């Protein structure tokens, strides 16, 4: 003698993929109430898998969309594809930049189509290609690939934290296990509406300005046995790294059309030295020791670090951006096994960059007048394991990049999106 | 206490379900689409509730007897040693049948009330 009874508001969820609101402080992310609220879920064990999470694809798409929307209205640099006459710079008026900066004279279109103006600019050698084997004939790197658009002066390059908030009828489960490795059961789970603030920082070899592991170093990978899968190493103690460019640039403008203004480097005012990043040797030694000890738990061989095997400038050197300058730093003093005192790493600056492969085609970053000085925290390392032969007594790990999703999987590994199903049917004595 | 009774037995979870019910410029396309989808889902659930005569109720009682082939567990076992997720997983194959039975019962009730008030 039992009858059906209908309950609305049953705590039952199912795995689902949806679009999530973007909060801060065609495409727009401007809600201003990121005030979090957390509810623990007692006696609930939930399965997590960070490598099958749609939040990373959503973040990829959102960052690409924001980048494209920012560069929509400002200057196109199609006249710059002109044959350049480049000679050695005259800077007479650890190392100097006389071998990296070239003084290029060319012709450009004025705001009247009938007259051309002969102008000059200082370009970095990484942004120029030589047309003839022995000659002074030079062109830009991107003229055979795409059309470049100037980074508009009002664009700010610093990251802003982004919160992801599930719409009504959904929830974000958060795994609070302090030694979580991204896959498996979680016995201490909480529920939230908006994730914690995540900064879309772009880097290649060392993860910067991120969160720290609560207890110990975490090694994460989709498949350890597959040497083609990158390894994310999340540290519990950040290492301070300070990068500077001591050269004093001059931001000078040329009117290249009816309202189109092109900014360039006139001359190097003084302090002729290469850009460099400073790091503390002892802290890096301790961090590397801890990483090696943690990795001994997964590989039963001696662990050594070697520099990247090869490739171009993009896939070999530590790329990052700050103040609006785009640095490529040579991390060979690190990842090579006195480490006393201060480690100084040389860096080179690039202006024509392609931050996202196939997105935005390319961007021209205008120079900044003053001396650039910048600080950051290393909170993670991306590594790649060289394919062994089964005979070597040691495994070689090299700092390597890859997809930029890895820069965000390290921040969204403890989140899951679920769909509420609030309609239950139960037998009860009522009628 | 949103979803706070997930790990609790249905005997205690059924108390104060209204927490879940309460929780249940230029805009982007995705934001507008999400809002419209949420409205549609709420309206669909309300349509199902209204079909059975449970329009504005959280704990709604019906007139369809419980068939033992749907689930033969004891009342104490159901309401004392299981959660909502496990129970809903167990009876997943009969939800569509029970929905149709509830709709038919409500229609029969309405027609019978009409006939009785005709007399």
């Amino acid at each position, epitope marked *: 003698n039992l009858w059906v009874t209908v309950y609305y508001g049953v705590p039952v969820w199912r*795995d689902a993929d949806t679009t999530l609101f973007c909060a801060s402080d065609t495409h727009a992310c401007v809600p201003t109430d990121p005030n979090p609220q957390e509810i623990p879920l007692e006696n609930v064990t939930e399965n997590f898998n960070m490598w099958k999470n749609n939040m990373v694809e959503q973040m990829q798409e959102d960052v690409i969309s924001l980048w494209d929307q920012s560069l929509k209205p400002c200057v196109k640099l199609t006249p710059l594809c002109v044959t350049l006459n480049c000679t050695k710079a005259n800077l007479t008026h650890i190392g100097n930049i006389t071998d990296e900066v070239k003084n290029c004279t060319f012709n450009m279109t004025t705001e009247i189509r009938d007259k051309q103006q002969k102008v000059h600019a200082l370009f970095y050698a990484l942004d120029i290609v030589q047309m003839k084997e022995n000659g002074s004939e030079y062109r830009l790197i991107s003229c055979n690939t795409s059309v470049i658009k100037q980074a508009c002066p009002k664009i700010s390059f610093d990251p802003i934290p982004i919160h992801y908030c599930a719409p009504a009828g959904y929830a974000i489960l958060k795994c609070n296990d302090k030694k979580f490795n991204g896959t498996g059961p979680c016995k201490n789970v909480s529920t939230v509406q908006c994730t914690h603030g995540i900064k879309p920082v772009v880097s290649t070899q060392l993860l910067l300005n991120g969160s720290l592991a609560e207890e110990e170093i975490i090694i994460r990978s989709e498949n350890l046995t597959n040497n083609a899968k990158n390894i994310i190493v999340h540290l519990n103690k950040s290492v301070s790294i300070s990068c500077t460019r001591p050269s004093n640039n001059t931001r000078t403008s040329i009117r290249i059309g009816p309202g189109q203004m092109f900014y360039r480097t006139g001359d190097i005012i003084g302090d002729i030295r290469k850009a460099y990043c400073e790091l503390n040797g002892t802290e890096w030694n301790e961090t590397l020791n801890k990483v090696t000890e943690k990795l001994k738990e997964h*590989f039963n061989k001696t662990i050594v670090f070697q520099p990247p095997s090869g490739g171009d400038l993009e896939t070999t050197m530590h790329h990052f951006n700050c103040r609006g300058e785009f640095f490529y730093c040579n991390t060979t003093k690190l990842f090579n096994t006195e480490f006393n005192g201060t480690i100084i790493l040389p860096c080179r600056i690039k202006q024509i960059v392609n931050m996202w492969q196939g997105v935005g085609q390319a961007m021209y970053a205008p120079p900044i007048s003053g001396i650039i000085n910048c600080t950051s925290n290393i909170t993670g390392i991306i590594l790649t394991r060289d394919g062994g032969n089964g005979n070597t007594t040691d495994e070689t790990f090299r700092p390597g990049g890859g997809n930029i999703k890895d820069n965000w999987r390290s921040e969204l590994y403890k989140y899951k999106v679920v769909q509420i199903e609030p309609l239950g049917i139960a037998p009860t004595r009522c009628k | 206490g949103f979803l706070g009774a997930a790990g609790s037995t249905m005997g205690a979870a059924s108390i104060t379900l209204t927490v879940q019910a309460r929780q249940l410029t230029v805009w982007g396309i995705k934001q507008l689409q999400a809002r419209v989808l949420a409205v549609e889902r709420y309206l669909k659930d309300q349509k199902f509730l209204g079909l059975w005569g449970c329009s504005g109720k959280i704990i709604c009682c019906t007139n369809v007897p419980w068939n033992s082939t749907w689930s033969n567990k004891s009342y104490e076992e159901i309401w004392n040693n299981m959660t909502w997720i496990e129970w809903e997983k167990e009876i997943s194959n009969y939800t569509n049948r029970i929905y149709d039975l509830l709709t038919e019962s409500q229609n029969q009730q309405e027609r019978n009330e009409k006939d009785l008030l005709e007399l």
Partner: antibody
Amino acid sequence: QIHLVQSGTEVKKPGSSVTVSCKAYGVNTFGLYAVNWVRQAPGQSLEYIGQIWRWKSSASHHFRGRVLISAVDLTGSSPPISSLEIKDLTSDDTAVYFCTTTSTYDKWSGLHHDGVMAFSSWGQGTLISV
Amino acid sequence: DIQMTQSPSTLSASIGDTVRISCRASQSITGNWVAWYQQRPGKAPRLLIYRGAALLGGVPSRFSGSAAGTDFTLTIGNLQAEDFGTFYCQQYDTYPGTFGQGTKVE
């Protein structure tokens, strides 16, 4: 692409103990996959021996105290491993032992019911003669 | 401790026929917690049906299942050569799981 590879045939004497291994190619981790060990006597039906699930090991009543089940997760050189240890063998234990894995990631899936499970993938089986 | 029995211990058929196999349980399983397996001689058994009437990836659409209380049925239509050997029947509603005695086809 779940391939389960098991050890070879072994011939033993009563009173001894045996160990059977199972390498799970394609299984990302045992935190999402449950491992079940079953028995098949020659000419009879399948019998369930034990399981490891969420790093908890269990055996049936007929085998408690004489079967020990262990497992280790993905390492740098080998896939996930599971292993049976059988103590105090008798003439009735001669059979083919099977290692099986079933996914547990989807909580709503019909392949498992609160620990007692179906067996989606099967190994080639090890023949043990005593 | 549910014990399941299969009635047609031995069967015979020709290519293109249709075969029905039945399992009876000592208790009603209202959750349809029944699985159907196939085993060819000298090979590991293969799982074909779970939840009474659900197919797997790669299993042909010819196989079908029905579940009702204590009676479960496996139906094979347009029988081919590959569908030979011993068919097994398992429950996983209670602990421990239990298998059937198997039915020989072909």
